[PDB]
Design a protein around this ligand. Sequence first.
Ligand SMILES: CO[C@H]1CC[C@H](n2c([C@@H]3CCCC(=O)N3c3ccc(F)c(F)c3)nc3cc(-c4c(C)noc4C)ccc32)CC1
Ligand SMILES: Cc1cc(N2CCOCC2)cc2[nH]c(-c3c(NC[C@@H](O)c4cccc(Cl)c4)cc[nH]c3=O)nc12
Length: 116
Amino acid sequence: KKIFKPEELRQALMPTLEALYRQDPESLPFRQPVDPQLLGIPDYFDIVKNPMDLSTIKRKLDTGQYQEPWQYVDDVWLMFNNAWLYNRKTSRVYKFCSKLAEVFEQEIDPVMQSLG
Ligand SMILES: CO[C@H]1CC[C@H](n2c([C@@H]3CCCC(=O)N3c3ccc(F)c(F)c3)nc3cc(-c4c(C)noc4C)ccc32)CC1
Ligand SMILES: Cc1cc(N2CCOCC2)cc2[nH]c(-c3c(NC[C@@H](O)c4cccc(Cl)c4)cc[nH]c3=O)nc12
């Protein structure tokens, strides 16, 4: 397997993470972990067993917790898939999720090609 240095993953993938953060208001529900107590949604962790958010992805990238870049891709789609699972199709959070996913799909392709 190709060996990836944590510093190469960080420098290569951080621009793609910024592309999600800079969407405002679209990124606002995703910047911090879902807090079901605050949001009044007691069933959240009955439905979402593996939560993920931008701050967790960013910390993992900054601290070298990804061994290979598709694990970063996995966490981003887990974030989005959790939100599409939990929220109604008509809800603002669901629509903002789809907006971020389109940005991600555009940005991630050339970066992954360059890491190969
Ligand atoms: C600490 O600052 C945060 C900002 C986002 C706030 N927020 C909000 C706020 C408060 C509640 C009412 C509302 O409409 N919100 C909101 C705020 C901004 C948005 F762009 C948006 F789509 C929704 N809704 C959130 C929903 C989710 C969510 C995700 C991701 N997946 O399932 C659920 C449920 C996550 C965060 C949400 C909560 C506090
Ligand atoms: C492109 C796309 C659009 C949407 N819709 C957007 C609008 O709202 C409705 C949903 C949902 C998606 N789910 C996934 C998805 C993954 N994709 C890999 C892809 O990024 C990828 C694949 C090969 C190379 C690269 Cl470089 C990148 C991987 C794991 N699990 C996933 O669920 N991709 C989706």
